[PDB]
Ligand binder design. Sequence first.
Ligand code: HG
Ligand code: ZN
Length: 258
Amino acid sequence: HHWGYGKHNGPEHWHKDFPIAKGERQSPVDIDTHTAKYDPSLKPLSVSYDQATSLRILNNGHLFNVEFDDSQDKAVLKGGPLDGTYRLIQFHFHWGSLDGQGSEHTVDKKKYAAELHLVHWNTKYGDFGKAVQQPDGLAVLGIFLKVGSAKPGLQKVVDVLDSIKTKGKSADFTNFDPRGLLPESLDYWTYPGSLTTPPLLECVTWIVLKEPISVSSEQVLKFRKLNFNGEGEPEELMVDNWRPAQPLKNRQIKASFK
Ligand SMILES: [Hg+2]
Ligand SMILES: [Zn+2]
């Protein structure tokens, strides 16, 4: 029936319902640090999240999304490789069943335990739905998570997971500050790509941060307790919801640092 991450409906089958899966600018990709072009003209990233307004958290059967009020420039991203302002609409994670896998992008083939995606849309286009019709409609900030010490700013999220265990459940999730999930440095790699889940639209300017954040093993364990299934159905743990690296093709990865 529909898409997932299993043997019968996983990433390798996606092309049947979404032909763009085999397109020219698909994500994720492996970041070869020795081939990435240092670009001195890349301006510093500008993350203005002081007015961020979170609204809800929801398990959609594939992963969980924390949604934000994007009716005004409350939480925006600009600078870096971007032209114009991009509004934060939601953030989600991709993780593995084990600590050695989970991230979508890899750095010199290295896989992290998880990857956080903060999705933004170009205000120039009015709304998210119109933004996904443009080659520069979206900007996703990717942050790697590695297992180590606990991330205080992630605990609020971890605590609420019990209430949205199954597919379709949602919970109010207000007053959450996304600044607590940012690493110290804002150095990054950037390249043009796509969303990593169907519809796999090629509308994304990826900004992948060099420095990962650390979360405890207990924090990641909570992620693995979520369910792909809806309430009452046989239990399928939500793990390994990541897409493998796609061919880079006619693309260049640029770094904002040396
Ligand atoms: Hg697009
Ligand atoms: Zn994602």
